Write a protein that binds this ligand. Structure first.
Ligand SMILES: N[C@@H](CCC(=O)N[C@@H](CS)C(=O)NCC(=O)O)C(=O)O
Ligand SMILES: N[C@@H](CCC(=O)N[C@@H](CS)C(=O)NCC(=O)O)C(=O)O
Ligand SMILES: CC/C=C\C[C@H]1C(=O)CC[C@@H]1CC(=O)O
Ligand SMILES: CC[C@H](C)[C@H](N)C(=O)O
Ligand SMILES: [Mg+2]
Lengths: 214, 569, 214
């Protein structure tokens, strides 16, 4: 049986969880007090000490995009997140890489900081949700014709939408509607329906760390 | 951090984990070294559910000649990852000769990891059997005094140089061995023979708290003790007035010793009164350190003739035998050190690497496939093949071992070998009769001074233009520059063939360089060789070294007491 | 023929180049005026505007890691980059991602900054350097039995070893002959033979980057 080291508000861990549930695998989850990281976990990544971690056949699998790639490669017979063509794989990877740059930083900036930092982050995330809007264009799922790589990669950011909407007192829906819309669309997959914990709580985590750093 | 009880229980756990550890060892080895070029030829990519089976079914057992071109490639100006991987920090040479030609093998920090753990392991087993004072010391006739760069600019050499110059050696060995008597400088002193005398001296200077005598060989101890019988008048005199003898002339060590010297009259009287008592040196080893409870050496194989003189030296002191293995791939640890020299058995450690043994039971030699570690039947003799991080994959070292027992879940190994005898025409000649001839004729100049030459080796450098052959000498004692210059010239004069003359007389290869080294260097060579993990067939040492030789290679340089090109020409 | 949107000093573009050349394809190298980016570039990757970007059959593949993977999959018939096993591809991936994140940032500090960032940068350089060297065990290449994905990812940095050599006031070789030397071995193959611009040119323009902004 596969074992996953996961964090309840971890979009990254959620990347892993959504992926594994997505293909068709029964597995075990273990929550981490990052204050005291696990012996199996410290063993997995002694330095980063960062999740999500999937262990198969005695080998710890690390990094989010890496973990999802690991998901496709681990059981290559039933559900593929990638298209048949090489270029398609490249487009998806390009976009997921897009998900991890100014985007993670952007949300990180809106829920994370305030004032001078906050607006910069706000325009950055609105701009990002918009370019995202442009590449989406029409597709049910970006990774391909069906649920894909990227879908798993950035769907997970949707639960935090509540947090971003309230902390920056925004409403990302009117400027760019199809993103949030598609997000709860993807909520339908059994992959993210159970793996991801509730938004009020995540937002609450957002309330708590904001409470400490003022 | 050192403890005996836990370290032994994890050993009991590990040894019991012999198959699991040997296979996992394979896994880390392959996974760490997936990219190796031989492997690409071999068709291996790792993982799979037949990794061990694929291991034994896809790639052929290598020999030193086949090894030599690639390793040669790693050393000669092309810093190149080959039969191992990353350019190795240092390189090694094994006993016998690769077609008579020199042999080059990889080194890595893992050698230190295994070395540290093995000495911790062994010291725990030995101190278990042989307890020592926390505040005492150890008489270690150890040396790693020569540092140099090979032609490619990558350091190439001995297990000892790397083991004692490694940043981790002092820290790693501080807790689990008794504090060295000798200052690290004397250990690394530019004059090893002067350092042997000094080592005897240092070794002799705090004996009240000594736990044991050390040399890696019974013959090593024999050298130190016969040498002991070769210099104590001088010793007492040097130490007595606080002024060291004129025999030692290197400034770092002399300055160091003079730091610890003063005139003290009485001690002479004492030392002098006891050592007279020995009826001719019967068991003086206990006498000089009255409290060591053992003598540490490798007293089997090529050393069986030497243990009695060591016993002759040791007297009634128990003889403890060293664990087996080298940087080439360590093999076994002596769980039972208190055993007699005639029965010494050492226990293999599982993660040092993955080994296989080739049987001899048909006639001579026979054709049976290599079989698993414990698969080896008791009482019969098997040659050893090893796969490790040492860069050596599935290689025939050609030496036979006998298994006599089992410790827990692991086998116990005994050796009766001498030399790994498969020899072919060597190219680092200058017929060996002529090399020996050269040393013999020239050394006569050193034979005028009541000292006979002991051992020697030679080198060829393609870096320098014109390249100069370098001959090295192990001797009985110190002498000035003029005679050795004559000796170099004499070695030149000695190789009598028409060819050596055409060249050197012409100019195409430079004046033979006599880099007179210091005593015990070959002794170190022997000491790392018999100790290597394989079998006792490891002592027909190489006469001349080309780009591909390494174990004599760190030893040749820094400690060149005298480096001179021929006055002639 | 494939169009490579590349930059003369950019390491990653160098990765793209070394990859296409290593495999066995004939492609066209395009330099760029960032001051005056080409219409092709601006259309190919409008938001990022960064290189490498390979246009193949009319399909543009940005990012060096993405492009090396692409060279691998569109054309995987002779000198495969990745190992056959998924966990192996994983190791190549994890390690390639590795040169590209912490290492890249730190060397960025070693040639582009001053004061504390410089000292911190050198330290991280050594600490990092031992780790990659540490995982190596003793492996001639990294990605596969011959030239590999992770190998492709870090080789271009071989050019930058000289710069780090003087500017970083450090020796990557005296303390770790292993890495730079690994690069030297990798410098016998034609791919790195012509892919990486001269060590001296890279170092001088690097110093120049230091001259242009304060
Ligand atoms: N690139 C990583 C980053 C994951 C990450 O940021 N994990 C956070 C959870 S909030 C973490 O482990 N923090 C632990 C720490 O700061 O040491 C991934 O996506 O796997
Ligand atoms: N992580 C990206 C790096 C892309 C990147 O940041 N490129 C830089 C230089 S290599 C760039 O294009 N800068 C634009 C500019 O200098 O104006 C990759 O793997 O290619
Ligand atoms: C594990 C320590 C490394 C070298 C240990 C060496 C010594 O200095 C005593 C024995 C040993 C020689 C041998 O076991 O091959
Ligand atoms: C500690 C060093 C040991 C003895 C090694 N086998 C050598 O002689 O170089
Ligand atoms: Mg030696």
């Amino acid at each position: 049986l596969p074992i996953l080291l996961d964090y309840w508000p971890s979009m990254f861990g959620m990347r892993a969880r959504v992926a594994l549930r997505e293909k068709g695998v029964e597995f075990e989850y273990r929550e981490e007090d990052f204050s005291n990281k696990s012996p199996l976990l410290l063993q997995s990544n002694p330095i980063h000490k960062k999740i999500p971690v999937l262990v198969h056949n005695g080998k710890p699998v690390c990094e989010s995009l890496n973990v999802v790639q690991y998901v496709d490669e681990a059981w290559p017979e039933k559900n593929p997140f990638f298209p048949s063509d090489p270029y398609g794989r490249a487009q998806a990877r390009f976009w997921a890489d897009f998900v991890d740059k100014k985007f993670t930083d952007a949300q990180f900036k809106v829920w994370g900081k305030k004032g001078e930092e906050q607006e910069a982050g706000k325009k950055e995330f609105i701009e990002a949700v918009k370019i995202l809007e442009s590449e989406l264009g029409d597709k049910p799922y970006f990774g391909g014709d069906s649920f894909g790589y990227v879908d798993i990669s950035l769907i997970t950011f949707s639960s935090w939408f509540q947090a971003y909407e309230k902390f920056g007192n925004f409403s990302i829906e009117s400027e760019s509607p199809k993103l949030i819309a598609w997000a709860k669309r993807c909520m339908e997959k059994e992959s993210v329906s159970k793996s991801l914990p509730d938004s009020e709580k995540i937002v609450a985590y957002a309330a708590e760390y904001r409470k400490n750093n003022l | 951090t050192f403890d005996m009880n836990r370290v032994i229980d994890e050993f009991d756990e590990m040894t019991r984990n012999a198959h699991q550890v040997q296979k996992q060892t394979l896994k880390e080895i392959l996974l760490k070294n997936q990219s190796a070029i031989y492997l690409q030829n071999c068709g291996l990519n790792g993982n799979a559910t037949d990794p061990e089976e694929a291991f034994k079914s896809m790639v052929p057992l290598v020999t030193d000649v086949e090894l030599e071109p690639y390793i040669k490639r790693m050393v000669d100006g092309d810093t190149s990852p080959i039969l191992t991987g990353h350019p190795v920090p240092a390189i090694s040479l094994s006993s016998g000769t690769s077609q008579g030609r020199p042999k080059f093998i990889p080194f890595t920090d893992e050698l230190m990891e295994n070395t540290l753990q093995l000495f911790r392991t062994a010291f725990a087993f030995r101190n278990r059997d042989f307890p020592i004072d926390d505040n005492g010391k150890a008489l270690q006739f150890i040396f790693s005094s020569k540092q140099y760069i090979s032609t490619g600019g990558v350091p190439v050499g001995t297990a000892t140089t790397n083991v004692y110059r490694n940043p981790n050696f002092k820290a790693g060995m501080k807790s689990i061995t008794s504090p060295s008597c000798s200052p690290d400088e004397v250990i690394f002193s530019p004059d090893v023979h002067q350092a042997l005398y000094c080592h005897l001296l240092s070794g002799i200077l705090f004996r009240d708290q000594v736990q044991y005598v050390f040399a890696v060989f019974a013959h090593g101890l024999v050298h130190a003790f016969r040498t002991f019988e070769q210099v104590w008048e001088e010793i007492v005199t040097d130490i007595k007035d606080g002024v060291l003898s004129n025999r030692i002339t290197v400034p770092s060590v002399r300055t160091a010793m003079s730091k610890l010297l003063t005139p003290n009259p009485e001690l002479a009287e004492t030392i002098r009164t006891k050592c007279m008592s020995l009826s001719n040196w019967y068991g003086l080893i206990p006498a000089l350190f009255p409290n060591a409870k053992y003598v540490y050496g490798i007293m089997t194989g090529s050393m069986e003739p030497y243990v009695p003189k060591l016993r002759h030296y040791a007297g009634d002191l128990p003889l403890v035998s060293h664990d087996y293995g080298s940087s080439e791939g360590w093999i076994a640890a002596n769980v039972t050190p208190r055993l007699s020299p005639e029965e010494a058995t050492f226990a293999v450690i599982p993660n040092l690497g993955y080994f296989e043994f080739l049987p001899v039971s048909e006639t001579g030699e026979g054709e049976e496939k290599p079989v698993g570690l414990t698969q080896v039947k008791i009482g019969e003799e098997y040659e050893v093949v090893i796969t490790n991080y040492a860069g050596l994959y599935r290689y025939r070292l050609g030496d036979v071992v006998k298994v006599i027992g089992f410790y827990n879940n692991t086998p116990q190994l005994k050796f009766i070998c001498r030399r790994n005898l498969i020899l072919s025409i060597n190219i680092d000649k200058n017929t060996e009769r002529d090399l020996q001839l050269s040393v013999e004729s020239a050394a006569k100049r050193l034979s005028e001074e009541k000292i006979e030459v002991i051992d020697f080796s030679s080198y060829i450098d393609v870096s320098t233009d014109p390249g100069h052959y370098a001959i090295f000498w192990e001797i009985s004692g110190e002498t000035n520059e003029d005679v050795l210059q004559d000796c170099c010239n004499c070695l030149d004069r000695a190789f009598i063939d028409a060819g050596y003359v055409s060249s050197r007389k012409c100019k195409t290869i430079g004046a033979l360089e006599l880099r007179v080294v210091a005593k015990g260097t070959f002794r170190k060579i022997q000491e790392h060789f018999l100790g290597l993990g394989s079998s006792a067939g490891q002592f027909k040492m190489p006469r001349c070294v080309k780009p591909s030789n390494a174990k004599v290679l760190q030893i040749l340089c820094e400690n060149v007491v005298s480096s001179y090109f021929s006055t002639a020409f």
